[PDB]
Amino acid sequence: GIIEFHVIGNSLNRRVLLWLVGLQNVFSHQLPRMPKEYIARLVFDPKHKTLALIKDGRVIGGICFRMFPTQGFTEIVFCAVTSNEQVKGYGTHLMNHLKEYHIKHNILYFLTYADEYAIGYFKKQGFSKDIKVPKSRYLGYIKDYEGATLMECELNPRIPYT
Amino acid sequence: GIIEFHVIGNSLTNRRVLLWLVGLQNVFSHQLPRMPKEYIARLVFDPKHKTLALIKDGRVIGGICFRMFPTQGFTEIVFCAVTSNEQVKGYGTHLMNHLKEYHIKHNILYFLTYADEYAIGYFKKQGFSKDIKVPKSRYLGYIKDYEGATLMECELNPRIPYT
Amino acid sequence: GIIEFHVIGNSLANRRVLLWLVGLQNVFSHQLPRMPKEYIARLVFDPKHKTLALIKDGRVIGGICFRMFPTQGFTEIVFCAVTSNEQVKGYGTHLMNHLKEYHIKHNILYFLTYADEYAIGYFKKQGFSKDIKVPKSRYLGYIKDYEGATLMECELNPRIPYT
Amino acid sequence: GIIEFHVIGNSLANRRVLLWLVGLQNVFSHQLPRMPKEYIARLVFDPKHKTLALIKDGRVIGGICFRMFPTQGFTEIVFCAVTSNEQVKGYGTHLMNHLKEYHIKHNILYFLTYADEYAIGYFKKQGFSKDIKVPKSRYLGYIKDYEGATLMECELNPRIPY
Amino acid sequence: GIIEFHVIGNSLNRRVLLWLVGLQNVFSHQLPRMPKEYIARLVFDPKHKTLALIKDGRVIGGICFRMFPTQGFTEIVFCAVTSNEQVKGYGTHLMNHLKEYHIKHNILYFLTYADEYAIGYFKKQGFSKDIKVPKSRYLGYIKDYEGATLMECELNPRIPYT
Amino acid sequence: GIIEFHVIGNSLTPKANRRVLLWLVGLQNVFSHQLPRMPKEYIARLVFDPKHKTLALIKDGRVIGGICFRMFPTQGFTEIVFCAVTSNEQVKGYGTHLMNHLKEYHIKHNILYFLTYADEYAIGYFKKQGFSKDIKVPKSRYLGYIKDYEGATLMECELNPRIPYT
Amino acid sequence: GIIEFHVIGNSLANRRVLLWLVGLQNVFSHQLPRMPKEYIARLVFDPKHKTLALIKDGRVIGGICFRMFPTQGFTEIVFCAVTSNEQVKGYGTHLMNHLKEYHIKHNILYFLTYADEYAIGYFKKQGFSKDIKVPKSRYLGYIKDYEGATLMECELNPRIPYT
Amino acid sequence: GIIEFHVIGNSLANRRVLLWLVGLQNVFSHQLPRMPKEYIARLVFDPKHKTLALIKDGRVIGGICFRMFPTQGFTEIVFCAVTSNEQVKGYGTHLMNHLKEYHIKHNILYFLTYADEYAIGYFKKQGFSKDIKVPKSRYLGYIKDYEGATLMECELNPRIPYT
Ligand SMILES: CCCC(=O)SCCNC(=O)CCNC(=O)[C@H](O)C(C)(C)COP(=O)(O)OP(=O)(O)OC[C@H]1O[C@@H](n2cnc3c(N)ncnc32)[C@H](O)[C@@H]1OP(=O)(O)O
Ligand SMILES: CCCC(=O)SCCNC(=O)CCNC(=O)[C@H](O)C(C)(C)COP(=O)(O)OP(=O)(O)OC[C@H]1O[C@@H](n2cnc3c(N)ncnc32)[C@H](O)[C@@H]1OP(=O)(O)O
Ligand SMILES: CCCC(=O)SCCNC(=O)CCNC(=O)[C@H](O)C(C)(C)COP(=O)(O)OP(=O)(O)OC[C@H]1O[C@@H](n2cnc3c(N)ncnc32)[C@H](O)[C@@H]1OP(=O)(O)O
Ligand SMILES: CCCC(=O)SCCNC(=O)CCNC(=O)[C@H](O)C(C)(C)COP(=O)(O)OP(=O)(O)OC[C@H]1O[C@@H](n2cnc3c(N)ncnc32)[C@H](O)[C@@H]1OP(=O)(O)O
Ligand SMILES: CCCC(=O)SCCNC(=O)CCNC(=O)[C@H](O)C(C)(C)COP(=O)(O)OP(=O)(O)OC[C@H]1O[C@@H](n2cnc3c(N)ncnc32)[C@H](O)[C@@H]1OP(=O)(O)O
Ligand SMILES: CCCC(=O)SCCNC(=O)CCNC(=O)[C@H](O)C(C)(C)COP(=O)(O)OP(=O)(O)OC[C@H]1O[C@@H](n2cnc3c(N)ncnc32)[C@H](O)[C@@H]1OP(=O)(O)O
Ligand SMILES: CCCC(=O)SCCNC(=O)CCNC(=O)[C@H](O)C(C)(C)COP(=O)(O)OP(=O)(O)OC[C@H]1O[C@@H](n2cnc3c(N)ncnc32)[C@H](O)[C@@H]1OP(=O)(O)O
Ligand SMILES: CCCC(=O)SCCNC(=O)CCNC(=O)[C@H](O)C(C)(C)COP(=O)(O)OP(=O)(O)OC[C@H]1O[C@@H](n2cnc3c(N)ncnc32)[C@H](O)[C@@H]1OP(=O)(O)O
Hints:
Chain F: It comes from Homo sapiens (Human). The structure is a homooctamer. By secondary structure, chain A is α+β, with helices and mostly antiparallel strands. Chain A has one domain (1-162). Chain A has helices at residues 14-30, 36-43, 90-104, 119-123, 135-138; strands at residues 3-8, 49-55, 58-68, 73-81, 109-114, 149-154. A six-stranded mixed beta sheet of chain A has the order 1-2-3-4-5-6. In chain A, strand 4, helix 3 and strand 5 form a beta-alpha-beta unit. In chain A, helix 1 runs antiparallel to helix 2 (36-43). Chain A starts with a strand and ends in an 8-residue tail after the last strand. The interface between C and D is medium-sized, with 16 and 16 residues.
């Protein structure tokens, strides 16, 4: 069906706001350990944005992120594809658009914390455990999950990702 | 008594508020005898300072005055006090827990403060540690230094309800 | 005689202020003979630069020229001078103490300046130190670097009165 | 014909500046044929990028595209080119010299650039070294990283104007 | 690949800005004998419009044209498809949308100058060397080119072109 | 029955009211039916073009005919675009009354020339309305302004402004 | 008798100008009885038309109705009349000179007119020729070719003082 | 000295321009004596006209008075003069060159003029020709065909820089 990618957020529109509830639902459901209250407060925060994957008008997931352009990196907050649509390449297409978007916006480092269950998806998206950004650049901006691995992805502004 | 919490401050944009701030400055000044009253009033009434108030029957009986540094990613704890005949009751801990809840909702997860030897044990029980994860390059020159006091730090878990 | 202090500047000037700046530019130039006159003019009349003028009987006799960097949490001292025949009467010190008082009230508590062989002993007596506590990462792209002079720092105690 | 120097940039209504930025983008993309044209064009027209432009008789013959990082105490040097038919005329040296002049007025005393094998000789001659005195924690994540090329620094001498 | 057509221009918007730069590049590169500045002056001239061919976000061709409603014709100014995309039909489709646009705006005559390497393309778009529009109507409005061949195309507003 | 002539059109500055708009649809229907080799999408585009106008023949409220035209007052002539009388009203002289009302309208607007293209099934009507195959307006004046039709005869009509046409 | 020349017309209004435009309509009609006075009134009152009026001692005694086609670079002479009791006094010629002068000052240098047989001598004397320099494509269908009427042209010299 | 080029013209307005226009009227008038001064002044101060003024140290030493007919696709060259003691230094050629650059910017790529016998060699060195590409229907009447003058044409190339 018609697949479409939109970067959306709760600015400073009905279809957008309902897409955001759709996203908040998909993060909660694929990310059980994340409290629903705190997924919601982040998804609906202005300083956060989300790349929404829309299959035929209906949200089937996306990537919630927080650009820190004073720092040169972007945090990756939530990632989920709905369970009946996983292992269809949908998550890689999501990351790649996310890369393209950040290319155009001169930001070329991703940082994220990964669980042991999900680390292999980030490895397969180019992420690495070798964190070249100085600790002093991110501590107190990215939400430390202690007991999860910090990972990093460097974007090349000269490859087309999409 | 009826207990209220309220975050307040001299916005550079109310009367119940104005006297609440006067009660805080009085409370802070009386519980912190080595803080110049003039200095206390200058910070409580500064606009980039906010103050969590604790109110028992309309009457200001404690609070945490604090300074949000959202660009630097932390908050400074300016004053803490519970008035004398309301101490040792758990009020201080309900203030700190509230103040934590606020700061999660505003996506700040670090408290920096300075502690003399008589307040270190208090902050320790609010979960403050001497080990400072925040880089000096980020707080020095923004937080009021206190040579002679232990700097302390608190990291918040936004997965968690404090109140 | 009748002395007064005023923190004047050039935003977007009175006749009274315009000539005061010109007076301040003259005093700065005369007491700093190897500073190009125009460079002094371009900073005294700069909008982001302010000046604490020292007036005696209506006439400019001294001043300190400074640039506040509240986003970086320090102020840059630019020019300091007392006219020839008013020196060594303490005018120098009260000019600093007034600037320290002004800066407590704006919660900037760090001065940074460069001092050549002809002024470091002045700055030593105003509490300046060669030990720079401010991060190099915080001022390098901001303050003019007078290579060949000694970078020096003053930290302010916002709890004591300076005047 | 008369020679001009002008530091221009994208901002927020001048036909002249606009066709000079296209002139620049063209000369950059011609002398850097292994860069994406879209990358050069997205940077030249970026408003946190500036470009020193070198004019001979109304049309662009050269320029230096750069990115000032005052809160880091240096400037990233992004693109350097003089057109073919005007090279080996000391033209690229006056560009680097006006750029130093401009930057000493603005209290930036460090240049950071990457240089491959075709360019490293020229930057050595304008005074750049491989000895990077800027801490890795001041520049990493701010300057466009180029694995494979060599990071070069140039340190400027401060000056009291007039 | 997601194909798009957009009739754009420089009214007196960044996406559109970078697109005109894309267009000015493609023109300049498929038309080496055209001054790069000259192409730039006409593409960024407000009374000029370019029909862009956008393939998966990037420009891969267009037609720059000049509508002369007073005179009752339009001037074809530049046509190019990027090298690796030629002989795929893109050119013919570009003309076909451009004929479609002009039907909807009551302009039913195209005029252009073509060198020998381009006569066949315009012949295949319905262009003829027989110029029905009077010389008084076009001379000193369309830029003439000593040497090239004046070519005319007449549109049927009762036909659908796309 | 009751007969009215109205010069109407898709005025793009005042809202064409419902009465006008339903007449613009009716004329589009009539032209389409009487001119079937003309695409109906073409007819609608032109009838509703703000630079076009239409003299509507209105009988007891319903549209029974019209002459849609385009005035080129810079060029000094007018194009005749569509002519139709509905079938059950033809050969009653309605065709001619429309043309004459149209001539009388144009001499008041100081345009004294009609140009049109006619195929063999229509050349006779326009001849009876005064058109000639002999075109005094120069080619440079009309070409690429009026919709050419190859295989139609271009036909011209010159109007005398000292004459009262209706 | 006091003689005035006024270029008037029915623009986008004045009592005096209105009664004059009627006075002109009369004179033209009466002097040109074989043109429908209906048609004369239309043109005289058309706003793209103008009439230079010959006012003698208050009353309208003649004039020239003309239509400027600036985009074409010519003016059409439409009606010319002096009332009867005032003919052969040179009034026709003074009207034509004031008209020439008027057009010089508007950068229009060509007059076209279709003339009946009873008029050719008057236009000849005013410098009109039957030899027509303007191209047919510039004037056809802007001025009305009347059958049996003679097109005449007058070309004007910007450097000549006509009045 | 300081040379400037200013396209000026009456606007249907500023003392510096007005005195420049009067200066231009004198320069033209003085170099072209057998042409009515009142005609030169009418044209210079007409608003459909513009003049490319050549200023050398405050004062008018020449210019090109021209007339853009953008409906018709060309500009009319009307008066070229350089004050007598500044001639044969190239001033009139920098004048035409500037005028060509101006017109390329407005998509007017043809200049028509009626040269007198003393002017022809100048127009020839500016690229003019007696072979007129522009159809007579496009210029006739719009410009004045002075008996004895030679119609000359210049086609501008918009891909070349002229200044
Ligand atoms: C602490 C918070 C940090 C965050 O931002 S959330 C951490 C990641 N989130 C989750 O795992 C939530 C639930 N999982 C999901 O929603 C999706 O499976 C997920 C991770 C978004 C991937 O989307 P999909 O469409 O399933 O992936 P895909 O079709 O594009 O295939 C990508 C390749 O990666 C591989 N992979 C490794 N670990 C995986 C894993 N844990 N889940 C899914 N795939 C994983 C998988 O083999 C897949 O195919 P291939 O091997 O490349 O051919
Ligand atoms: C440079 C200084 C700037 C600043 O940040 S202000 C520093 C703090 N200021 C002051 O303490 C001035 C006055 N202090 C007070 O009024 C109170 O002691 C204080 C610290 C406000 C706490 O208010 P309370 O309502 O009494 O707190 P609470 O009932 O929740 O009990 C806290 C538990 O911690 C324990 N504790 C250890 N050392 C303490 C200490 N020095 N002060 C208070 N409590 C202390 C105490 O036993 C109490 O109960 P528990 O052991 O947790 O069961
Ligand atoms: C590169 C940036 C350029 C600058 O702004 S740094 C240069 C500072 N300005 C100058 O050197 C301009 C000429 N000098 C002056 O105007 C004055 O001497 C100066 C330093 C501004 C202070 O004016 P005064 O009225 O003399 O200050 P004061 O009465 O409070 O003197 C108190 C104590 O200062 C002491 N001192 C040491 N070195 C000094 C020195 N180089 N200049 C002046 N005083 C100096 C002096 O001995 C006196 O001692 P004490 O306080 O009585 O124990
Ligand atoms: C990616 C981050 C930014 C970059 O690194 S962009 C890479 C540099 N760009 C390019 O190389 C593009 C193509 N080349 C050019 O545009 C110009 O040649 C270039 C490199 C800008 C130099 O400008 P020019 O005006 O041609 O040079 P110039 O006349 O001032 O001569 C300076 C002296 O340097 C010397 N040199 C050594 N290697 C060179 C080299 N690879 N390219 C040019 N000159 C080089 C050259 O011998 C000349 O000698 P001298 O000092 O005048 O005696
Ligand atoms: C003086 C300025 C005046 C102007 O308007 S610019 C004149 C055009 N300039 C240029 O063509 C220079 C570069 N050429 C190109 O960009 C493209 O080839 C061009 C001409 C735009 C056509 O785009 P394409 O995508 O290649 O065309 P297409 O696939 O639709 O092929 C249509 C048929 O045209 C035919 N044709 C004849 N000459 C051609 C020629 N020189 N280039 C391309 N095609 C040409 C060609 O055989 C092609 O295939 P077929 O005939 O259907 O079998
Ligand atoms: C390419 C687009 C050009 C255009 O403008 S559209 C061409 C005109 N429309 C059509 O051909 C299609 C449909 N026809 C009609 O609606 C009507 O018949 C038409 C042509 C509008 C005339 O309307 P009516 O009211 O019937 O005419 P009427 O009563 O005033 O006069 C009838 C007399 O005309 C005569 N006539 C000769 N050729 C004709 C011809 N080709 N079409 C119609 N009538 C024609 C017919 O013999 C009759 O004689 P009479 O004048 O009464 O003595
Ligand atoms: C623009 C077209 C308007 C039309 O419809 S035709 C315009 C002419 N209208 C008329 O003749 C109708 C009434 N006539 C008049 O009002 C006057 O005759 C007319 C033509 C306005 C001239 O007015 P006046 O005051 O009598 O003229 P004027 O004193 O300046 O004498 C000029 C010389 O014209 C001469 N002329 C030759 N043919 C003429 C002709 N057939 N009609 C009138 N005059 C004619 C007449 O002999 C007189 O003296 P001269 O012997 O040429 O030196
Ligand atoms: C049709 C427009 C209205 C007219 O009638 S324009 C009548 C032109 N003449 C005048 O206005 C009065 C007399 N002359 C002048 O004002 C000036 O000579 C004039 C024509 C404006 C030219 O400007 P200048 O600064 O004097 O001369 P220039 O140094 O720029 O160009 C001179 C080169 O052209 C050549 N030339 C041939 N006939 C000429 C001629 N009759 N006048 C001037 N130059 C002529 C001559 O070889 C000279 O050589 P070179 O390029 O200086 O090395």
